[PDB]
Amino acid sequence: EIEVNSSVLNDEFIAHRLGLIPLTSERAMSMRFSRDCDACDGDGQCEFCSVEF
Amino acid sequence: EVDLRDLGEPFLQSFCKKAATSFFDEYGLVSHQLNSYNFFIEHGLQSVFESSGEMLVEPSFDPTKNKDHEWRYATVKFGEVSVDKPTLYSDDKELVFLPWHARLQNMTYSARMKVNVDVEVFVKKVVILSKKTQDIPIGRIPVMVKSVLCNTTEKGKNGESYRKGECAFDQGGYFVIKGAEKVFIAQEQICTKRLWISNSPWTVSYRSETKRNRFIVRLSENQKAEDFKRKEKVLTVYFLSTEIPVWVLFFALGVASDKEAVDLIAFDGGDASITNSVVASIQEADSVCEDFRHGRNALAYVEQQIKGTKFPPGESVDECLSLYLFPGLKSLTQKARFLGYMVKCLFSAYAGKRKCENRDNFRNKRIELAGELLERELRVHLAHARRTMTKAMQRHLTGDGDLKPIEHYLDASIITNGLSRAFSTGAWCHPFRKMERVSGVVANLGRANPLQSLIDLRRTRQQVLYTGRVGDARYPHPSHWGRLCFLSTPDGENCGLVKNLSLLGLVSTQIMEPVVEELFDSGMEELMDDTSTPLSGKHKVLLNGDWVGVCSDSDYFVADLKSRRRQSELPRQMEIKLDKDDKEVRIFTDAGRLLRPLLVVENLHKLKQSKPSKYTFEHLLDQGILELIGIEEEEDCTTAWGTKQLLKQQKSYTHCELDLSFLLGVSCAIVPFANHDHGRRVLYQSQKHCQQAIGFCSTNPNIRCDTLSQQLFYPQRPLFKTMASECLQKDVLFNGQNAIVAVNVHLGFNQEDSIVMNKASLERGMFRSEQIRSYKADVDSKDSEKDEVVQFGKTHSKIGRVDSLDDDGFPFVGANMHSGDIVIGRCTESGTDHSVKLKHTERGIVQKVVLSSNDDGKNYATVSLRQVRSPCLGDKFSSMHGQKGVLGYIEEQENFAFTNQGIVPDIVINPHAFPSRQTPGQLLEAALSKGIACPMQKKKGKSDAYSKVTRHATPFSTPSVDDITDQLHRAGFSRSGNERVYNGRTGEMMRSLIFMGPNFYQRLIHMS
Amino acid sequence: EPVTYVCGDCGQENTLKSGDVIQCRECGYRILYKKRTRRVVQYEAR
Amino acid sequence: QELKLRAIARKGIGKDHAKWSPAATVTFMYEPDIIINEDMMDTLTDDEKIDLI
Amino acid sequence: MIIPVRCFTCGKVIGNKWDTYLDLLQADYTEGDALDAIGLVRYCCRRMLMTHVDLIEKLLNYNT
Ligand SMILES: [Zn+2]
Ligand SMILES: [Zn+2]
Ligand SMILES: [Zn+2]
């Protein structure tokens, strides 16, 4: 979700570069696919999926 | 140093590279457009207006005294013309005017012309405001970008070049006409001021574009064919009528007797047919008039110029008309000699000693750029303005009323509307017949690449005359060598008529500062003032097709003229032509030849003795190491094919070319291995596929409001290098990405010229494009006629879909405009909608909203949508070698064949494409780039191990097979180009070795 | 927020009202971009 | 110029997009069995030895 | 424009290696020695660094 963007790049370029930044995933074998979670239908942070940055 | 070795090939090839990059530093690539427009503004604009003194005879009446011819015959004449820089003429402190204002406001980037007219009508021949007329508005002329009038040129780099109207890729040889970007195409004309020898009626010809009273001499017409007559020379139609025999026009010009007129012609002697022809000429001459008796017995037969003419050439039809033949000649004793020279040329052409004039040999052709075309159009509309003015002066006979001489009669809108319709409609004036129109002139300017603009600014065009044996008008003629391009051309309706100016080509402009007296200092005895016959077999020196003298031992004379030119003592745009067989010297100071520079093989070679680290091009033209050479002069020069080994095998060369890849066009010279492909494939790549590839767009996208701007994300340069791409240093000449290509059979999805990509590579950003489209509308001023008011608003009564529009009538700047919405709310106050709506296939995020206007309030609206596209399963791609396809199958990563390093291809193509289409250049390119990008083992000791690496795939000078294969042996891979893979499904060894390696591919527009 | 249009070379916010001749005040140039207000927008990093 | 946004990470695998694949090189190879003769190698000459090496 | 993260063919992260590449070419190194100094063994990444066109600067100059 972009609130303000006033650079020379565009929104999809920045989102595309953010998608490729590797995050350390050692609790990902114990996390759950977000289509399989009962909670977290609020487009935000959760505890078995959906870490927020 | 006379051996010219010991300063050998790594020095000379380095000098050629430095000279070529200094060439493009000084001249650029739009040099000829700018030079011709600048020359028009500096000289030719004032040169047009000097026409006459504007007499006025006012023929209305003569019954009575108070309407006699007693009101004064007026007089008025033009003086200086002054042209402003273009300003935006608003009241309350007028403003400076820029081309981006003209594009975004839909007006014409034009400047005002002011003329210093003088009028001194004064009553003294009946039976004044020269002052207060300094600045009279006379039309508005448009202005080329980067001209001597455009406001984007006075500051060099970082004073204020950043204005609000710039790109870093733009060089600007275009116009802006009511919001659109126009561009001239170079025309092609015959070289007049030269004798022209036909052969169907044998009619040797003295043309003149000006002075439309000029003649031809025709020998192959007998007037009858009953039994047979001898061929006699009749000096046929002379004043658009009035045939005369040749001998009446001899003794009218004062030849004393015969046997000097035979020595004025001075043919071979013998060859009976010639002397039979001339005695038949005399016998025809005395049959129509008894000539050579008085000063008026022969000159009185020149009589058809009076009444039997249909068009009497002015008043005083007598010896005053003798300055309508040969105005460059000054007295009759030279005009008689030049008539004898014409007849000698005709007789020499009859006996098969002089070949007739081949039209498609480009030394007989002058190219008309923007200067001459503006000359022609402005002369037409100015002549109409003069007639319209003098008809307006006559309505005020014998009563003044409104007499202020200026600003009541001289209407600027005439020339304004004329020059506007010339650019906007394409109704361009024909160069010969001053009533019709021609069309294949000024076009639109492409912007899809920054290479399409370069190709669109460098073009020359042969017209269509009549389709009955055009001859060789669409086939490369050996005079194109080094000047035009013999590989790339369009195909279709105009295949070979539109030609591409080469890299090192240049166009001469004009030579002022007259050079008749400059030739005396090397030879050049002056022409006599009597027939007599003292003229030996000495050579002849013409100047733009004009006898101005006669010299002898011309082998030294032209050597001294070239030596004065190389020491910067004669002007640089002057061709020196020594015809040794016809015994003739031609000197050209002409406007519109084709010039290119060459290495002069000096006998001292200053490069060894001096060696600075800089070479400006003005500096290298002073020492005479380089030299601007035309087409005429070059055929007397034996030029080598490069310093490589070829200027070192002999010393029988007088020049050298810089490098052979500069023979090609701007878009063909950068193709790797370009002399290996079939010619049809290179035509494809260098005319259509380079002009369509998706890549760079601009470096200020906030101002370009045009339909369908497109752009990649990550543009690249190729792994290899060519000569021209290195000397130019524009990485915007390459629009695509370095894909890895493996040739192998896939499951049947890459058949019939179809290609297979990799989904993982597509998901990391590869070939991902981004398009921007603009939607436009308009409404009147504010309230005036100068209801049907369709003022931009909301109209809240829910006509269509208004979820995103604001109160002003336009959406906001983060919207997500859908498949079919309302994009501009152009609705009236009470009636139905006139609002613009999206159609079925346009959608996207709003990028900006631009709202401008015109002088009469015509408010303009601009909305740009943005989209991001990844390449789908229907899109088209191509290599650098005319090898195109359609993406037919997008494959997941773990099913491709992988090498022992784990490398996967990005594009897989079918091996049935190569043995038929004859492009081994793609395989050689893949092997070269694979040998570049790999590391190099055994680097410990004995070398730095990265210095004997070939990166140059220059077209006509290319690396050998042994170089490439020994490089692949040094890099560790197999010498045959192949590579062993394992399968991505069964996992075991595929039996056939696979050819892999990187290749520069391209993505083309018109996606589906 | 209101519309708050921005000029091209002034950079000054004219905050345009109902349709006059399009012309930036404090000058005479006629560019008049539209300012982006403060919203949110959703995107998939794909 | 500024840039305010808020990103939400989730869980996925490499078949949905390339951003979730943690590999960046996974490959294997066989290993050869070379059974070079000694009664043919002593026949041919020393320059031929240093050539075919 | 900017260097792409994730070399398109294999998937190694190269998005941080640009400035050290410019500094190694600035010092005195040729391109082979520079890429062997940063540690890129397979040519799928070497072709991604050697052929990158950096266009962000020309965009930064032409804004206001
Ligand atoms: Zn949850
Ligand atoms: Zn303003
Ligand atoms: Zn890799």
| Interface residue A29 vs chain C (CB under 8 A) | no
Chain E contact set for A13 (CB, 8 A): 1
| Interface residue B960 vs chain D (CB under 8 A) | no
Residue C27 annotated as binding site = no
The rounded distance, in Å, linking the Cα atoms of B113 and B139 is 6
Query: Rounded to 5 degrees, what angle do the CA atoms B705, B711, B715 make?
Result: 145
The rounded distance, in Å, linking the Cα atoms of B107 and B140 is 12
Chain A contact set for C42 (CB, 8 A): 1
Measured CA distances, B566 to B511, B634, B640, D12 (Å): 17, 15, 20, 74
DSSP H helices in E1-64: 18-27, 31-38, 43-50, 56-61
In angstroms, the separation between the Cα of residue C18 and the nearest Cα of chain D is 31
Return the residue in A7, A10, A13 with the most chain B beta carbons within 10 A, the one to mutate for interface testing.
A10
Measured CA distances, B530 to A42, B253, B327, B337, D24 (Å): 109, 12, 18, 9, 95
Burial class of B1000 by CB neighbour count within 10 A (0 to 12, 13 to 18, 19+): buried
Radius of gyration of chain C (CA): 14
Chain C contact set for B815 (CB, 8 A): none
The rounded distance, in Å, linking the Cα atoms of B702 and C8 is 10
The secondary structure of chain C in percent helix, strand, coil, rounded to multiples of 5, reads: 0, 15, 85
Most distant CA pair in chain E, distance: 42
How remote is the CA of residue B662 from the centroid of ligand 1, in Å? 66
In angstroms, the separation between the Cα of residue D39 and the nearest Cα of chain A is 57
Residue of chain C whose alpha carbon sits nearest to that of D7: C45
Q: Are D17 and C43 in contact (CB under 8 A)?
A: no
Long-range contacts of B179-183 (CB under 8 A, 24+ apart): B179/B102, B179/B103, B179/B105, B179/B106, B179/B107, B180/B444, B181/B103, B181/B444, B181/B445, B181/B447, B182/B423, B182/B442, B182/B443, B182/B444, B182/B445, B183/B442, B183/B443, B183/B444, B183/B445, B183/B456, B183/B457
Single-letter amino acid code for the residue at B374: L
Burial class of B352 by CB neighbour count within 10 A (0 to 12, 13 to 18, 19+): exposed
Residue-wise burial string across B330-351, b where 16 or more C-beta atoms lie within 10 A, e elsewhere: eebbbbbbbbbbbbbbbbbbbe
In angstroms, the separation between the Cα of residue A15 and the nearest Cα of chain C is 5
> What's the total number of domains in chain C?
1
- Smallest Cβ–Cβ distance between A1 and the set C38, C41, C46 belongs to C41
- The set of chains that have 3 or more CB pairs under 8 A with B is A, C, D, E
How remote is the CA of residue E7 from the centroid of ligand 3, in Å? 7
The rounded distance, in Å, linking the Cα atoms of B383 and B733 is 45
The residue segments making up the domain with residue B209 are 194-351
CA B338 centroid distance within chain: 35
Chain A contact set for E63 (CB, 8 A): 8
Q: Are B846 and B813 in contact (CB under 8 A)?
A: yes
Q: Are B319 and B237 in contact (CB under 8 A)?
A: no
Q: Do C46 and D7 touch (CB under 8 A)?
A: no
Residue of chain E whose alpha carbon sits nearest to that of A7: E60
B57, two tokens = 């005879």
B791, two tokens = 């003022």
| Interface residue C25 vs chain B (CB under 8 A) | no
CA B54 centroid distance within chain: 37
- The set of chains that have 3 or more CB pairs under 8 A with C is A, B, D
B283, two tokens = 């016998």
Q: What's the length of chain B?
A: 1008
Chain D contact set for B760 (CB, 8 A): 14, 18, 21
Query: Rounded to 5 degrees, what angle do the CA atoms D6, D11, D14 make?
Result: 115
The rounded distance, in Å, linking the Cα atoms of C23 and C31 is 7
| Interface residue B740 vs chain E (CB under 8 A) | yes
Q: Do A6 and D1 touch (CB under 8 A)?
A: yes
Beta bridge partners of B181: B176
- Smallest Cβ–Cβ distance between A13 and the set B713, B764, B845 belongs to B713
Beta bridge partners of B777: B861
How remote is the CA of residue B963 from the centroid of ligand 3, in Å? 27
Q: Do B714 and E4 touch (CB under 8 A)?
A: yes
The residue segments making up the domain with residue E41 are 1-64
DSSP B930-969: HHHHS--S--SSS--SSSS---B--SSS---HHHHHHHHH
DSSP category for residue B254? T
Method of determination? Answer: cryo-EM
The rounded distance, in Å, linking the Cα atoms of B34 and B41 is 11
Residue A53 annotated as binding site = no
Chain B contact set for C41 (CB, 8 A): 814, 816, 845
Q: Are B638 and B654 in contact (CB under 8 A)?
A: yes
Beta bridge partners of B539: B551
In angstroms, the separation between the Cα of residue A20 and the nearest Cα of chain E is 7
How many CB pairs below 8 A link D and E?
13
Chain E contact set for B997 (CB, 8 A): none
What is the arrangement of strands in the sheet containing B365-368, beginning at the earlier edge strand? B365-368, B186-190, B460-461, B498-499
HSE toward the beta carbon, residue E44, CA cutoff 13 A = 23
Q: What resolution in angstroms does the PDB record give? A: 3.6
Return the residue in E2, E5, E6 with the most chain D beta carbons within 10 A, the one to mutate for interface testing.
E6
Measured CA distances, B888 to B683, B754, B765, B793, B877 (Å): 26, 6, 19, 47, 11
In angstroms, the separation between the Cα of residue B901 and the nearest Cα of chain D is 7
- Smallest Cβ–Cβ distance between B90 and the set C9, C28, C39 belongs to C28
Helix pair E18-27, E31-38: axis angle to 10 deg: 130
Residue E47 annotated as binding site = no
How remote is the CA of residue A52 from the centroid of ligand 1, in Å? 12
| Interface residue B904 vs chain E (CB under 8 A) | yes
The rounded distance, in Å, linking the Cα atoms of B986 and B669 is 45
Chain B contact set for A11 (CB, 8 A): 845
In angstroms, the separation between the Cα of residue B710 and the nearest Cα of chain C is 20
Closest CA to B511 of B595, B626, B580: B595
The rounded distance, in Å, linking the Cα atoms of E4 and E1 is 8
Q: Do D18 and E6 touch (CB under 8 A)?
A: yes
Chain A contact set for C43 (CB, 8 A): 1-2, 11-12, 15
Helix pair B370-393, B412-425: axis angle to 10 deg: 140
How remote is the CA of residue B926 from the centroid of ligand 3, in Å? 18
Return the residue in B890, B894, B975, B988 with the most chain D beta carbons within 10 A, the one to mutate for interface testing.
B894
> What's the total number of domains in chain E?
1
- The set of chains that have 3 or more CB pairs under 8 A with D is A, B, C, E
Q: Which helix (H) or strand (E) holds B119?
A: strand B118-119
Chain D contact set for B901 (CB, 8 A): 27
Q: Do B868 and A20 touch (CB under 8 A)?
A: no
Single-letter amino acid code for the residue at B267: F
Closest CA to B125 of B193, B73, B55: B73
The rounded distance, in Å, linking the Cα atoms of B216 and B202 is 10
In angstroms, the separation between the Cα of residue E34 and the nearest Cα of chain B is 11
Torsion of CA A31, A37, A42, A43, to 10 degrees: 50
Q: Are B913 and B745 in contact (CB under 8 A)?
A: no
* 3-class state of residue B335 by DSSP: helix
